[PDB]
């Protein structure tokens, strides 16, 4: 009953932040004062698409 | 009693019983499709109720 669309693998590449959770954490009460915008933008879109393939960009 | 007021009171009575008649037919008719097709008051089994139903936004995002 119809197929799943998913994202090509490049519509996925993204450069990704590679330091560990304890570097998140160090980071993570200034982190969230300095990039709230984004993020909350970011979260908006998840609780209303309820789709990861609609939130990717 | 005359005939007249028998005969009379005869039609009365047969007036009744046929309007009876007539309504005990149709209501077997009427249970037959509210029962069949269940889109009538009767025969109406219970489905859950929406309300119960919570829409605030839960701990994650897909549901």
Known sequence: PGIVELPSLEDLKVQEVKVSSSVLKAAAHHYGAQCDKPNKEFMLCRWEEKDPRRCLE | DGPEKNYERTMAI???EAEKAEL???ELEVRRLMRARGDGPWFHYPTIDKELID???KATPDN
């Open chain 2, 14 to 16: 047969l007036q009744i």
């Open chain 2, 24 to 26: 005990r037919l149709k």
């Open chain 2, 55 to 57: 829409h605030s936004p």
